[PDB]
Symmetry: C3
Subunit: 264 residues, 3 copies
């Protein structure tokens, strides 16, 4: 025959523990995500894996904020960069042989360094001509690799590949996104946005049968976007909250006993 507020206190404690456990579980289920920007003065030389079927690389150069007009739009020019060639097997199906021409991408961003590439496909029956390209983080990391074919088979799964069509000048603005996985993977990936500009075919009609591919690679900005996942569920903070609530309840019970022995 007392106040019996201990029952209400126990109910409050049970409810608070239950809601705290539910909150911790739902916070552990749904991590939040954070984005930051790391400014880099000079990117590492990216690798550009082009896939020309039969078109030959007429020209390739390292340009700057402007490209001078082509002296010969559709004739063999000058290749003026470090390019390699690799042959590997497509991870999707082991019955196809893929030949990749690897180009060292532009490093300088403050100066807006460009990689300008021009291919010509002489004759083909394909209705929609297009050259595929893949981007990987470092060309140097590709050079000193024991298994170049294995490197490219890994890059096929690690990165997504796009394509640029003939009759255009595809201007590819590429940027780096580093996703720091919960396992500390630090997976680096490429994002890119294009702008296709028509090619004014001024060549004589005799040579108009051949198709011309122009593509320009640069970095859109000297910022690498780092994306991380943050776990908002901290067990120790939960323990501290539970301890504080339990202490508050215990002191409330003590004050209730004091009130009972004073007035009630």
């Amino acid at each position: 025959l007392l106040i019996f507020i201990y029952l209400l206190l126990m109910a409050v404690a049970v409810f608070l523990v239950y809601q705290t456990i539910m909150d911790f579980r739902e916070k552990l289920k749904h991590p939040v995500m954070s984005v930051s920007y790391k400014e880099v003065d000079r990117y590492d030389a990216p690798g550009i894996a082009l896939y020309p079927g039969q078109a030959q690389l007429l020209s390739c150069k390292h340009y700057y904020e402007v490209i001078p007009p082509l002296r010969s739009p559709g004739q063999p020019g000058d290749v003026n960069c470090t390019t390699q060639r690799v042959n590997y097997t497509d991870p999707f199906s082991n019955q196809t042989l893929k030949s990749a021409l690897i180009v060292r991408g532009p490093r300088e961003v403050q100066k807006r360094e460009l990689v300008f590439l021009q291919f010509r496909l002489n004759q083909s029956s394909e209705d929609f001509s297009a050259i595929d390209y893949l981007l990987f983080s470092s060309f140097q990391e590709f050079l000193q690799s024991p298994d170049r074919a294995g490197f490219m088979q890994a890059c096929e799964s690690a990165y997504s590949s796009w394509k640029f069509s003939g009759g255009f000048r595809t201007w590819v603005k590429m940027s780096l996104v580093e996703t720091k996985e919960e396992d500390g993977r630090e997976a680096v990936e490429f994002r890119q946005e294009t702008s296709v500009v028509n090619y004014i075919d001024q060549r004589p009609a005799a040579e108009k049968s051949a198709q011309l591919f122009f593509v320009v690679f640069e970095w859109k900005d000297p910022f690498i976007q780092k994306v991380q996942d943050i776990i908002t569920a901290n067990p120790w903070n939960t323990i501290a909250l539970l301890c504080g609530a339990f202490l508050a309840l215990f002191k409330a019970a003590e004050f209730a006993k004091l009130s009972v022995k004073w007035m009630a």
Copy 2:
């Protein structure tokens, strides 16, 4: 004539309560956002509502990782998928009749299933020919609907519509984004990125007046992106924190009284 640290304690309590209320209010005002990825082996067959004005669907097929070259670039071919037709009214303005050709999109993603569509518009006065397309989540959810016109009028507001031009082969990479609203709406939407590739018109000059539209639909990856809003303002955690601070202040006051009766 005592220490009168109770006044400082009350000031600290008032400041802590004020800052806690402000922090809770600003956390309730700005929910955080979380992104997760759900891997699906086979997407549900999406619905592609195309809006051909007068162009007739020459061909449509379910292809795989490659498209064989067209046997007849601009002549009636074979339609080899499930297509329906609906007529409804534009939700914005009730004075226009919209006729939509609904195509069952590709399901398989591991096999890189394609939907290839080819239209031909014979003659028109339009300077810039383009066919509009809208994407909705399920074609099956469209088949068994009591009000197909109502379904399309809802799809107009629920989804965004794009267009693909003639003289190109628009390759649409489409992915699904499920935004879980605070009201548990779980609104599903489509994102898409294209790649226009020129069409090498090898048809005779007599038939070059007619315009050809080509479009390819697939899924870019087998990942549905779920975006959720997390409320970082928890009333019960706030109550526990306030209780802990109040208890700390009370025990500090008790120890101050002990110090007064000991030395001070």
Copy 3:
């Protein structure tokens, strides 16, 4: 010769304080991001700084959800909006003079107001012709500016510039993103996604030498995306957690003493 649980209590307190400091440091290092959407019935009129090299603005009009077919595809039409001209210097290199044609952007989104622009470049040696465009928030904020050249030089750094090619009708869907920086900068920026549609050159072959640029500007939706960074590290919450945990440890020690004087 006692229980000496005080040593374990001190170790627990040290570990708890250490992990709390580490958690606070890593939370202060990595702020989370919050995204919100503010609906505006009528955007403030944006400023479109176009950079025509030698092409003259044939036509420019404020249209609505449809554009009627051009009465004269490549002849001087009617300019029917507020346009200004400014001359300034490129912030990157002070040796180039940039002439900008500032155009009054579309305000209404409910009515889907369009800005339709048509330029004609008579003769040039450029292989890939394109007109550059920059978007800034307010044209009115540009009109009453003491230093228009300084305003444009600041807009060059504050905003990113794109380009639209000839032989196309680029439809630019633009939207506003306000990033609220930690310093309360409230930096406003423009995002845009395009859709190039081929231009069917029906003009006589005599006038086909000149290149035509068409572009359409509207707002994709009446939503401004506000992106904020939230600091999850609250010093006062950490103080409350530490105080509650310290009190829990103190009461545990008191109960241990009670147990010692009772049984142990």
